[PDB]
Structure 1
């Protein structure tokens, strides 16, 4: 017996939608939901979505509050809709998927993922919810996450991290590393071997290996010496070159993190969404070196070193395809005289 006043009651009393009975007085003014708390209006939600304010309010209240795969993973795996949940995209302040299944009467295309409208869509199934592994077995298309083994299904160990209420973390009290499964046209698909992005921030960047500790602590020329990275253009690619008007390289998040402690810079996130590779309009405050489209990827430094060291440096230019987060990322490799000139996530 769904209602705006019941959704608001659940938000106010339970912190989110919890199936409780009750109603609070609500007022809707433009794109904001308010509730009366002893005579005055208190803001409950500001709609930042392209959906009607009361509809977005309901989807946000009904968001999955368990650790869930990051939106970039779900997108790279071709997920269209989730089964009986809402994956809230905290990067966009909006639902990650346009439609719902058994969540909200306004956005629902079906009450159950077994209805024929869902057959051509890649439905997201959560093995931690009763009956969802079975629902995935009947689904023509879908992506399944489990905490353990599913008899007969060959698993794909996903990233260590998951999003819990907008917080990307590697769980200690909760499990965040799932097994992944995919189905395309009724056939289970073998998920490729892949690297995973680390999902770290610039403000709170922490090294996750000895190489990463040595990169952040050592000087440029001695880190390169220690790790035998001569001829691999890490000075340009990872460290970044701030000597010319156009900023050179700076494509690994760890190199942006190292620069960040010395001097600050602006990263304009002109397409604010979750993705494996992020494009930024970067302006370095110290030097004034800038770049309109600077592709940045957060790979573990060891993974990036393994990728670049596994390439043939005999051709002037070529497209190098690397599977990261289940998606094929094209990198442009530019070589001269048997050494790397530049290696960057290719701008389409």
Structure 2
């Protein structure tokens, strides 16, 4: 017994859609949903999606309010659709997937993922919901997340962090570390050995190791000195060269976090989505140095050190593929006389 008036009632009284019965009066003026809160109109939802205002209002209200895998993780694992839930893409103010299953009649391609329409698309299954583990076992294609062990299935320990209502966090009061399982054409998969991006902010960056505390506390030539990083171009790649017209290096988030405490800079996110490697148009406000496409990746500093140290420095330029967030991230490794000139994530 779904309706715009019942969906808005749930937003008004339960904070989101809770299946409760009741209706509040709604008015729609363009791409914005309002409700008469005694006399005057109070805005419940502003549509920022490509979907019709009422269809997207419902999807937003029927979003998952539990910690779910980050959109980048789901996209890297070829997830197409979610089973009986809406993964809200909080960085895009839109539903993460094209269609739904058993959620909104207007976006729904199926009511249950058992239907032939779902057979070819990798349906996401939340093992924390009743019966979704068995739905994954019978599903032709899928991605399952579980909190604990699944009999028979070989687990793949995912990232420590998950998204709770847009907030990317490492849960303490809730579990955010999941077991990943992927299936392709009925065959259970052996997920790759992978690294995970730390998914941190520039404003609230916090070091997650002793190397990260030493990088943020110690001066440039003494962090490298302590960690034997001579000839790995950390001064260029991680610290960033702000001396010339084009901003040099600055590809690890920890370097942007360190440059931030001292001086600010503009990061223009021209493709605002969730990806393992993010591209920014940076302008360092102090020096005036700038770059149009500056690929910034947030790896744990020890992980980037372990990646660059596990490399061959003989050729001038080669493509270094690294499995990060279940995806093959290509990097361009530039060299000269046994040392790194630059090592940035490849612009593909």
For residues 140 and 334 of structure 1, the distance between their equivalents in structure 2, rounded to whole angstroms, comes to 43
In structure 2, the gaps of 5 or more residues are none
For residues 187 and 40 of structure 1, the distance between their equivalents in structure 2, rounded to whole angstroms, comes to 57
For residues 201 and 171 of structure 2, the distance between their equivalents in structure 1, rounded to whole angstroms, comes to 17
String of CA shifts for 1:51-78, please: whole Å, max 9, x gaps.
0000000000000000000000000000
Pair 1:327 & 2:331 matched: no
Query: SS state of the match for residue 343, structure 1?
Result: strand
Cα deviation, residue 189, structure 1: 1.0
1:340 corresponds in structure 2 to 340
For residues 28 and 147 of structure 2, the distance between their equivalents in structure 1, rounded to whole angstroms, comes to 40
In structure 1, the gaps of 5 or more residues are none
For residues 284 and 77 of structure 2, the distance between their equivalents in structure 1, rounded to whole angstroms, comes to 35
Cα deviation, residue 294, structure 1: 0.1
For residues 119 and 297 of structure 1, the distance between their equivalents in structure 2, rounded to whole angstroms, comes to 34
String of CA shifts for 1:20-56, please: whole Å, max 9, x gaps.
0000000000000000000100000000000000000
Deviating above 2 A after TM superposition, structure 1's stretches of 4 or more consecutive aligned residues are none
Cα deviation, residue 18, structure 1: 0.1
For residues 269 and 218 of structure 1, the distance between their equivalents in structure 2, rounded to whole angstroms, comes to 29
For residues 129 and 39 of structure 1, the distance between their equivalents in structure 2, rounded to whole angstroms, comes to 41
How many pairs align? 348
Cα deviation, residue 282, structure 1: 0.3
For residues 212 and 171 of structure 1, the distance between their equivalents in structure 2, rounded to whole angstroms, comes to 21
For residues 270 and 331 of structure 2, the distance between their equivalents in structure 1, rounded to whole angstroms, comes to 21
For residues 73 and 52 of structure 1, the distance between their equivalents in structure 2, rounded to whole angstroms, comes to 27
TM-score (norm: length of structure 2): 1.00
String of CA shifts for 1:206-248, please: whole Å, max 9, x gaps.
0000000000000000000000000000000000000000000
For residues 189 and 300 of structure 2, the distance between their equivalents in structure 1, rounded to whole angstroms, comes to 27
For residues 346 and 275 of structure 1, the distance between their equivalents in structure 2, rounded to whole angstroms, comes to 14
Query: SS state of the match for residue 84, structure 1?
Result: coil
Query: SS state of the match for residue 238, structure 1?
Result: helix
Query: SS state of the match for residue 136, structure 1?
Result: helix
1:228 corresponds in structure 2 to 228
For residues 13 and 281 of structure 2, the distance between their equivalents in structure 1, rounded to whole angstroms, comes to 42
For residues 41 and 316 of structure 1, the distance between their equivalents in structure 2, rounded to whole angstroms, comes to 64
For residues 51 and 134 of structure 1, the distance between their equivalents in structure 2, rounded to whole angstroms, comes to 32
Query: SS state of the match for residue 117, structure 2?
Result: helix
For residues 150 and 300 of structure 2, the distance between their equivalents in structure 1, rounded to whole angstroms, comes to 30
For residues 24 and 302 of structure 1, the distance between their equivalents in structure 2, rounded to whole angstroms, comes to 53
Over the aligned positions, Cα root-mean-square deviation in angstroms equals: 0.3
* Residues 119-268 of structure 1 mapped to structure 2, 5 A cutoff: 119-268=119-268
For residues 317 and 293 of structure 1, the distance between their equivalents in structure 2, rounded to whole angstroms, comes to 19
String of CA shifts for 1:106-149, please: whole Å, max 9, x gaps.
00000000000000000000000001000000111100000011
Query: SS state of the match for residue 72, structure 2?
Result: helix
String of CA shifts for 1:162-200, please: whole Å, max 9, x gaps.
000000000000000000000111111110000000000
For residues 19 and 112 of structure 2, the distance between their equivalents in structure 1, rounded to whole angstroms, comes to 18
For residues 218 and 31 of structure 1, the distance between their equivalents in structure 2, rounded to whole angstroms, comes to 50
For residues 149 and 135 of structure 2, the distance between their equivalents in structure 1, rounded to whole angstroms, comes to 16
String of CA shifts for 1:238-268, please: whole Å, max 9, x gaps.
0000000000000000000000011000000
For residues 126 and 37 of structure 1, the distance between their equivalents in structure 2, rounded to whole angstroms, comes to 36
TM-score (norm: length of structure 1): 1.00
